[PDB]
Amino acid sequence: MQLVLAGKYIGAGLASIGLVGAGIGIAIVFAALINGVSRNPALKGQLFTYSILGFALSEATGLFALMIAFLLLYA
Amino acid sequence: MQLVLAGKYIGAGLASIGLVGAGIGIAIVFAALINGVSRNPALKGQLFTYSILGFALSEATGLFALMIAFLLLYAV
Amino acid sequence: QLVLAGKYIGAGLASIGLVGAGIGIAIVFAALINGVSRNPALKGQLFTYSILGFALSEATGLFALMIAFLLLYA
Amino acid sequence: QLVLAGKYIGAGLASIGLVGAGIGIAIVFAALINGVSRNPALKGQLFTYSILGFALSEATGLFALMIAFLLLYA
Amino acid sequence: QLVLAGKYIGAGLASIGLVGAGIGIAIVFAALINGVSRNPALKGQLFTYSILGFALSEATGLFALMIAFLLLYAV
Amino acid sequence: QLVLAGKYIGAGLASIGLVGAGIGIAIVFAALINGVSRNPALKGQLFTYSILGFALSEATGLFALMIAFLLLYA
Amino acid sequence: MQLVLAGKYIGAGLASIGLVGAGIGIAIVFAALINGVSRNPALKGQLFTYSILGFALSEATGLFALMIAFLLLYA
Amino acid sequence: QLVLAGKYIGAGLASIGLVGAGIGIAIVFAALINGVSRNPALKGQLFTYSILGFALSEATGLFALMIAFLLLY
Amino acid sequence: QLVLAGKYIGAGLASIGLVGAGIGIAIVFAALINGVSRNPALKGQLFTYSILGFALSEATGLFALMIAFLLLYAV
Amino acid sequence: QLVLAGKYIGAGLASIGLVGAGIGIAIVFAALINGVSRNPALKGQLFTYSILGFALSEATGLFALMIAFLLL
Amino acid sequence: SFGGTGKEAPTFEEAAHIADEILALDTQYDDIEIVYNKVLSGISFEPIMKESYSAKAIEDAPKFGQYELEDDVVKNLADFSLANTIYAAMAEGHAAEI
Amino acid sequence: LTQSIYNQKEVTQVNIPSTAGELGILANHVPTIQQLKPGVVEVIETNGETKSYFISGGFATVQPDSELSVNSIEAFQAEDKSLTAEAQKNAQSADEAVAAEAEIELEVLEALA
C-alpha cells in the first residue's frame, strides 16, 4: 500500500501541469481585450462581456486538471 | 494489484496534460472574437455564433482527455 | 499488474497528443473570425475552408484518442 | 510481461507526436483564411497549396502514428 | 520511504504549472504596453483591466504552487 | 526482457521529436500562402523556396523516424 | 533513505523547469516595451514602469519555482 | 541489461530535441517568403541571410542526433 | 548509487529549464530589430533596453544551470 | 549498472535543452529579415545585432550540451 | 492634353478624369512637380513650382517612423495627394485668373 | 471638402470607420493612418453632445499634435430610395463590360442610415 499512495502523489503533481493551458489562456483573452479597447474604446462595454465569457471557459479547463489532483490526494 | 492502482493514478494525471490544448484553444477563439469585433463591430451577432462553434469543438477535445482521466479512477 | 500498468500509463499519455487538436481548431476558427471580420463577403467561402481545416486538425487528435481506447479494451 | 508493458507505454507516447499535426494543419488553413480574406482572386491557386500544406503536415503525424502501430504488432 | 519520495518528485512536477503564469502575466503586460502605446489616453482604464486580468492568470500558477506545497505536507 | 522494454518505450518518445515537422511544414505553406497573398506575381520564385524550406524541416523529421527504426529492428 | 534522497534530487531538477515561464515571460515584456517605445516614441517614462512591474511579477513565478527547488534540496 | 535499456531510452529522449530544430529551420523561411513578398528587390541578400538561418538551427539538431547515436552504438 | 543515479537524472532534467532562456533572448532581440526598423533614431536608447531584457532573462537562465551543477559535484 | 544507466538516460534528457536554441536562434533570423525587408538601408547595423542575438542564445545551448556530456 | 477645362468653376470629378490619365500612360517619373499661380490680395499672379512627392520618395523618408500605417497600401497615398494637388492648383490658379 | 465644417482648435471625441475595422481616436493617439470605408461616422462634443456625419472615402492623417484630421468627399449631417433599389438591381445584373462600377455603388448604401 506504500506504492499506491506513492503513485497518488506522483499523478497529482502531473495533474497540475494542465494548469499551464489556463495560465496562458486567460492571458490571451485579456490580451485581445486590452488590444481591442486600445484600438476601439467605444466597444468597451461590449468586449468586457466577451472578456468575462472568454477566460471563464479557459479557466474551466484548468479547474478540471485541478480537480483530478485533489482526487489523487484525498481519494 | 498494487502496481495496477499506482498505474491507474499516474496515467490519470498524465491524462490531464491534454487539457492544455483546450485551455489555450478557447482563448485563441475568443482572442479573435475580441480582435475581430473591435475592428468591425457590425459583425458582432455573426462572429459570436462562430466563436461559440470553435469553442465547443476545442472543448470537446479536452473532454476526450478528461474522459480518460476520469475512466482510470473509477473504471478498469 | 505489469501487463496492466502499460495499459493505464500509456493510455493516459495518449491524451497528451490531444493538445495539437485543441489548439488547432482554435487557430482555424481564430483566423476565421480574424478573416471574416476583415471581409464579410468572403464568409461563405472561408467557412468551407474552416470546417475542412478543423476536421483534418481534429483527425490527428482522434488518432491519439483511438490508441487510448485500444490499450484499455484490446 | 515486461516487454508487453513497454509496447503499450510507447504506444500512447507515440500518439503525442500528433500534436504537431494538430496545430500544423490548422496553421495551413489558418493562413489560407488569413490569405484568402485579403485577396479573393487567389482562392483556387492557394487551395491547391493548402492541400499540399496539410498533406505534408499530417503525413508526418501519420509517421508518428505509424510507429504506434508498429509497436503494437511487432 | 516510498511515499516520501513520491511527495518530493511530484512536488517538482507541480512547479511545472508555474510556466503558464510566467508566459501568461507577460502577454497581459505586453498587451498593456502595446495597448497603452497605441492609445495613451486610456492608461487609467488599461491599468484597471491589466490588473483585473493579471489577478486571474497568477491564480493558475498559485494553484500549481498550492499542490506543490500540499504534497509534502498532507498526511 | 528489460532491454526490450526500453526499445519500445523510447521508440514512442522518439516519435514526439517529429512534432516540429508537423508545425514546421505548416509554417512553409503559411508563409507561402502569406507570401503569394502579398504579391501574386511572385508564385514562381517563392514556391521554389517553399519546396526547399519544407524539405529542410522534413529532413529533421526523418532523423527522429530514423532512430525510432534503429530502436525497433536494429 | 537513498530512495527518498534520490527522489529529493529528482524533483529538484523537475522543479527548475518551472523557470522557463519566467525566461520567456520577461522577454515578452521587453518584446512589447522596445516595440511600444519605438511605435510611439513620445512616452518612455510611462511604459518603462509597466515593463519593470511586468517582469517582476513574471520573475516572481520563477522565484516560486526556485523556492520549491531549494525546499527539495535542503529540506 | 538495464545499462542497455537505459542507453535505448536516452536515445529516444535525445531525438525530442529535433522539434526545436524542426521549428528553428521552419521560422527561417517564415521571414524569407514574407520578406521577398513585401520587397522582391532584396532576394539576393535575404536568401544568403536565410542560409545561415537554418544552418545554425541544423547544428543544434545535429548535436541531439549525435548524442542519440552515441547511446545506440 | 541509487542517489548517484538520481543525481545524474535530475541534472539532465534541470537543463530543460534553459529553454526559457534560449527562446527568451531572441524575443527581446526581436523587438530590438523591430524597434530600430520602425524608428532608426532610437538605436542608442533601445539597445540598452534590449540588453537589459537579455540580462534579466539570462540571469534566470543561470539558475537552471546552477541547480544542475549542484547535483553532479556539490553534493 | 544503475549509475551507468542513469548517465545514459540523463544525457538524452539534457539534449532537450537544445529545443530552446531552435525556436530562439530562428526568431533572431526571422526578425532580421522582417526588419531588413521594411528598411533595406539598415543592413550593416542590424546584422551586427543579429549575430549578438544568436551567439548569446547559442552559448546557452552549449551549457545544455555540456551537462549532457558530463554524464556521458 | 485635353481642352475644355475652364468653362465654369472646376469640380472634383474632372480632376480624377486627368489625374488617373497621368497614371494611365506610364509610371515613369518619381519627381512630379505641379506649376500653378499663387494669389495674394488679388494684386497679381505668382510664378512658382510646387512639388508632389512620389511613392518611392514618400516611403524613403528619414523621419517617417512616427506614422503607424497597418502595413496597408502606401501607393494610394500618392494618388490621393496628387489628385488633390491638382484640385488645389485648379483653385488658386483659378483665382489668379479672376 | 465640398463643405468645410471643423476647425483644429480643441481636442474632441470622434470615431472612424476604417478598412482595418471601425476604430476610435482620442487625445494623443498614435499616428495610425489607413483608408476609411463608406460608413457611418459618430462625432460627439464635450459633455456628450450627439452629432454625426458621413464619409465616402479618404484617409485620416494623425500627427503628435493631439488633433485629428479627416478628409472625404461627402460631409453632411445624417438627417440630410426607389431609384436606388433599381440602381441596386441594375448593379446586380451586369454584362461583360467591366462590372466594377456596379459593386462599388452598393457598398456606400450598406449604412442606409
PDB file of N, CA, C and O in Angstrom, chain A residues 3-4 6-12 14-15 72, chain B residues 3-17 72-73, chain C residues 8-9 12-13, chain E residues 13:
ATOM      1  N   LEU A   3       3.164   1.880  -2.327  1.00  0.00           N
ATOM      2  CA  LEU A   3       3.326   2.312  -3.709  1.00  0.00           C
ATOM      3  C   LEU A   3       2.053   2.936  -4.269  1.00  0.00           C
ATOM      4  O   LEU A   3       2.126   3.885  -5.056  1.00  0.00           O
ATOM      5  N   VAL A   4       0.886   2.412  -3.881  1.00  0.00           N
ATOM      6  CA  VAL A   4      -0.378   3.019  -4.293  1.00  0.00           C
ATOM      7  C   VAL A   4      -0.440   4.468  -3.830  1.00  0.00           C
ATOM      8  O   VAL A   4      -0.775   5.373  -4.603  1.00  0.00           O
ATOM      9  N   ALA A   6       2.125   6.227  -3.100  1.00  0.00           N
ATOM     10  CA  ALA A   6       3.214   6.941  -3.762  1.00  0.00           C
ATOM     11  C   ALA A   6       2.812   7.386  -5.162  1.00  0.00           C
ATOM     12  O   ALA A   6       3.145   8.500  -5.585  1.00  0.00           O
ATOM     13  N   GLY A   7       2.102   6.529  -5.900  1.00  0.00           N
ATOM     14  CA  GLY A   7       1.600   6.929  -7.204  1.00  0.00           C
ATOM     15  C   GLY A   7       0.489   7.953  -7.115  1.00  0.00           C
ATOM     16  O   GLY A   7       0.271   8.720  -8.058  1.00  0.00           O
ATOM     17  N   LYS A   8      -0.230   7.982  -5.989  1.00  0.00           N
ATOM     18  CA  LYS A   8      -1.247   9.006  -5.783  1.00  0.00           C
ATOM     19  C   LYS A   8      -0.624  10.395  -5.734  1.00  0.00           C
ATOM     20  O   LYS A   8      -1.220  11.369  -6.208  1.00  0.00           O
ATOM     21  N   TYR A   9       0.577  10.505  -5.168  1.00  0.00           N
ATOM     22  CA  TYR A   9       1.263  11.783  -5.043  1.00  0.00           C
ATOM     23  C   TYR A   9       2.103  12.132  -6.264  1.00  0.00           C
ATOM     24  O   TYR A   9       2.566  13.272  -6.373  1.00  0.00           O
ATOM     25  N   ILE A  10       2.309  11.189  -7.179  1.00  0.00           N
ATOM     26  CA  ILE A  10       3.013  11.469  -8.426  1.00  0.00           C
ATOM     27  C   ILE A  10       2.061  11.992  -9.491  1.00  0.00           C
ATOM     28  O   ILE A  10       2.335  13.004 -10.141  1.00  0.00           O
ATOM     29  N   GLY A  11       0.928  11.311  -9.684  1.00  0.00           N
ATOM     30  CA  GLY A  11      -0.038  11.759 -10.672  1.00  0.00           C
ATOM     31  C   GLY A  11      -0.680  13.084 -10.318  1.00  0.00           C
ATOM     32  O   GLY A  11      -1.086  13.837 -11.208  1.00  0.00           O
ATOM     33  N   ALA A  12      -0.790  13.387  -9.022  1.00  0.00           N
ATOM     34  CA  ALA A  12      -1.313  14.684  -8.612  1.00  0.00           C
ATOM     35  C   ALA A  12      -0.362  15.812  -8.990  1.00  0.00           C
ATOM     36  O   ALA A  12      -0.811  16.918  -9.312  1.00  0.00           O
ATOM     37  N   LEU A  14       1.608  15.550 -11.659  1.00  0.00           N
ATOM     38  CA  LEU A  14       1.447  15.593 -13.106  1.00  0.00           C
ATOM     39  C   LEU A  14       0.118  16.215 -13.516  1.00  0.00           C
ATOM     40  O   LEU A  14       0.010  16.742 -14.628  1.00  0.00           O
ATOM     41  N   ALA A  15      -0.890  16.167 -12.643  1.00  0.00           N
ATOM     42  CA  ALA A  15      -2.186  16.761 -12.944  1.00  0.00           C
ATOM     43  C   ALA A  15      -2.163  18.282 -12.889  1.00  0.00           C
ATOM     44  O   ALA A  15      -3.022  18.923 -13.505  1.00  0.00           O
ATOM     45  N   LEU A  72      -6.642  12.524  -6.502  1.00  0.00           N
ATOM     46  CA  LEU A  72      -5.483  11.675  -6.271  1.00  0.00           C
ATOM     47  C   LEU A  72      -4.818  11.931  -4.927  1.00  0.00           C
ATOM     48  O   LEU A  72      -3.947  11.154  -4.526  1.00  0.00           O
TER      49      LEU A  72
ATOM     50  N   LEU B   3       0.622  -2.381  -8.156  1.00  0.00           N
ATOM     51  CA  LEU B   3       1.111  -1.655  -9.322  1.00  0.00           C
ATOM     52  C   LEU B   3      -0.034  -1.223 -10.230  1.00  0.00           C
ATOM     53  O   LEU B   3       0.082  -0.215 -10.936  1.00  0.00           O
ATOM     54  N   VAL B   4      -1.143  -1.968 -10.220  1.00  0.00           N
ATOM     55  CA  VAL B   4      -2.301  -1.607 -11.033  1.00  0.00           C
ATOM     56  C   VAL B   4      -2.865  -0.264 -10.586  1.00  0.00           C
ATOM     57  O   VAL B   4      -3.066   0.648 -11.396  1.00  0.00           O
ATOM     58  N   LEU B   5      -3.132  -0.127  -9.284  1.00  0.00           N
ATOM     59  CA  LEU B   5      -3.667   1.128  -8.764  1.00  0.00           C
ATOM     60  C   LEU B   5      -2.684   2.272  -8.971  1.00  0.00           C
ATOM     61  O   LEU B   5      -3.084   3.388  -9.322  1.00  0.00           O
ATOM     62  N   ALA B   6      -1.389   2.013  -8.765  1.00  0.00           N
ATOM     63  CA  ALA B   6      -0.385   3.051  -8.971  1.00  0.00           C
ATOM     64  C   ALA B   6      -0.336   3.491 -10.428  1.00  0.00           C
ATOM     65  O   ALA B   6      -0.128   4.674 -10.722  1.00  0.00           O
ATOM     66  N   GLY B   7      -0.527   2.551 -11.358  1.00  0.00           N
ATOM     67  CA  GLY B   7      -0.590   2.914 -12.763  1.00  0.00           C
ATOM     68  C   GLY B   7      -1.868   3.641 -13.129  1.00  0.00           C
ATOM     69  O   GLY B   7      -1.863   4.511 -14.005  1.00  0.00           O
ATOM     70  N   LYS B   8      -2.977   3.299 -12.467  1.00  0.00           N
ATOM     71  CA  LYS B   8      -4.237   3.993 -12.699  1.00  0.00           C
ATOM     72  C   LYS B   8      -4.179   5.455 -12.282  1.00  0.00           C
ATOM     73  O   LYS B   8      -4.958   6.266 -12.794  1.00  0.00           O
ATOM     74  N   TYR B   9      -3.274   5.811 -11.371  1.00  0.00           N
ATOM     75  CA  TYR B   9      -3.202   7.158 -10.821  1.00  0.00           C
ATOM     76  C   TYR B   9      -2.171   8.036 -11.515  1.00  0.00           C
ATOM     77  O   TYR B   9      -2.401   9.238 -11.678  1.00  0.00           O
ATOM     78  N   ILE B  10      -1.036   7.469 -11.931  1.00  0.00           N
ATOM     79  CA  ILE B  10      -0.050   8.249 -12.673  1.00  0.00           C
ATOM     80  C   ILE B  10      -0.576   8.577 -14.065  1.00  0.00           C
ATOM     81  O   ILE B  10      -0.504   9.725 -14.520  1.00  0.00           O
ATOM     82  N   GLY B  11      -1.120   7.574 -14.759  1.00  0.00           N
ATOM     83  CA  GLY B  11      -1.670   7.813 -16.083  1.00  0.00           C
ATOM     84  C   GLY B  11      -2.862   8.747 -16.072  1.00  0.00           C
ATOM     85  O   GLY B  11      -3.106   9.459 -17.051  1.00  0.00           O
ATOM     86  N   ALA B  12      -3.621   8.761 -14.973  1.00  0.00           N
ATOM     87  CA  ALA B  12      -4.744   9.685 -14.866  1.00  0.00           C
ATOM     88  C   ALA B  12      -4.264  11.129 -14.789  1.00  0.00           C
ATOM     89  O   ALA B  12      -4.878  12.025 -15.378  1.00  0.00           O
ATOM     90  N   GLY B  13      -3.169  11.373 -14.065  1.00  0.00           N
ATOM     91  CA  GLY B  13      -2.582  12.701 -14.052  1.00  0.00           C
ATOM     92  C   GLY B  13      -1.943  13.074 -15.373  1.00  0.00           C
ATOM     93  O   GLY B  13      -1.918  14.251 -15.745  1.00  0.00           O
ATOM     94  N   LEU B  14      -1.416  12.083 -16.096  1.00  0.00           N
ATOM     95  CA  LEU B  14      -0.911  12.333 -17.441  1.00  0.00           C
ATOM     96  C   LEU B  14      -2.046  12.601 -18.419  1.00  0.00           C
ATOM     97  O   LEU B  14      -1.851  13.303 -19.418  1.00  0.00           O
ATOM     98  N   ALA B  15      -3.237  12.062 -18.146  1.00  0.00           N
ATOM     99  CA  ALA B  15      -4.396  12.311 -18.992  1.00  0.00           C
ATOM    100  C   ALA B  15      -4.960  13.716 -18.821  1.00  0.00           C
ATOM    101  O   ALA B  15      -5.825  14.117 -19.606  1.00  0.00           O
ATOM    102  N   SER B  16      -4.495  14.465 -17.823  1.00  0.00           N
ATOM    103  CA  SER B  16      -4.909  15.847 -17.624  1.00  0.00           C
ATOM    104  C   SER B  16      -4.006  16.846 -18.335  1.00  0.00           C
ATOM    105  O   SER B  16      -4.369  18.022 -18.436  1.00  0.00           O
ATOM    106  N   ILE B  17      -2.840  16.410 -18.823  1.00  0.00           N
ATOM    107  CA  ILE B  17      -1.970  17.297 -19.583  1.00  0.00           C
ATOM    108  C   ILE B  17      -2.593  17.671 -20.922  1.00  0.00           C
ATOM    109  O   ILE B  17      -2.275  18.729 -21.476  1.00  0.00           O
ATOM    110  N   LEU B  72      -9.768   6.157 -15.634  1.00  0.00           N
ATOM    111  CA  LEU B  72      -8.761   5.410 -14.891  1.00  0.00           C
ATOM    112  C   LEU B  72      -9.018   5.415 -13.392  1.00  0.00           C
ATOM    113  O   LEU B  72      -8.489   4.552 -12.683  1.00  0.00           O
ATOM    114  N   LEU B  73      -9.817   6.361 -12.894  1.00  0.00           N
ATOM    115  CA  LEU B  73     -10.066   6.445 -11.460  1.00  0.00           C
ATOM    116  C   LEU B  73     -11.195   5.518 -11.025  1.00  0.00           C
ATOM    117  O   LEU B  73     -11.082   4.843  -9.995  1.00  0.00           O
TER     118      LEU B  73
ATOM    119  N   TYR C   8      -2.584   1.373 -18.667  1.00  0.00           N
ATOM    120  CA  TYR C   8      -3.102   2.551 -17.979  1.00  0.00           C
ATOM    121  C   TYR C   8      -2.190   3.761 -18.134  1.00  0.00           C
ATOM    122  O   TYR C   8      -2.674   4.872 -18.381  1.00  0.00           O
ATOM    123  N   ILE C   9      -0.877   3.570 -17.988  1.00  0.00           N
ATOM    124  CA  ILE C   9       0.056   4.685 -18.115  1.00  0.00           C
ATOM    125  C   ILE C   9       0.070   5.208 -19.544  1.00  0.00           C
ATOM    126  O   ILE C   9      -0.006   6.419 -19.780  1.00  0.00           O
ATOM    127  N   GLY C  12      -3.075   7.107 -20.664  1.00  0.00           N
ATOM    128  CA  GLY C  12      -3.098   8.462 -20.145  1.00  0.00           C
ATOM    129  C   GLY C  12      -2.138   9.384 -20.864  1.00  0.00           C
ATOM    130  O   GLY C  12      -2.429  10.573 -21.035  1.00  0.00           O
ATOM    131  N   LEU C  13      -0.988   8.859 -21.291  1.00  0.00           N
ATOM    132  CA  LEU C  13      -0.070   9.610 -22.136  1.00  0.00           C
ATOM    133  C   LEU C  13      -0.613   9.820 -23.542  1.00  0.00           C
ATOM    134  O   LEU C  13      -0.049  10.624 -24.292  1.00  0.00           O
TER     135      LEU C  13
ATOM    136  N   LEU E  13       7.196  18.306 -10.049  1.00  0.00           N
ATOM    137  CA  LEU E  13       6.294  18.249 -11.193  1.00  0.00           C
ATOM    138  C   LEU E  13       5.150  19.241 -11.052  1.00  0.00           C
ATOM    139  O   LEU E  13       4.623  19.728 -12.059  1.00  0.00           O
TER     140      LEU E  13
END
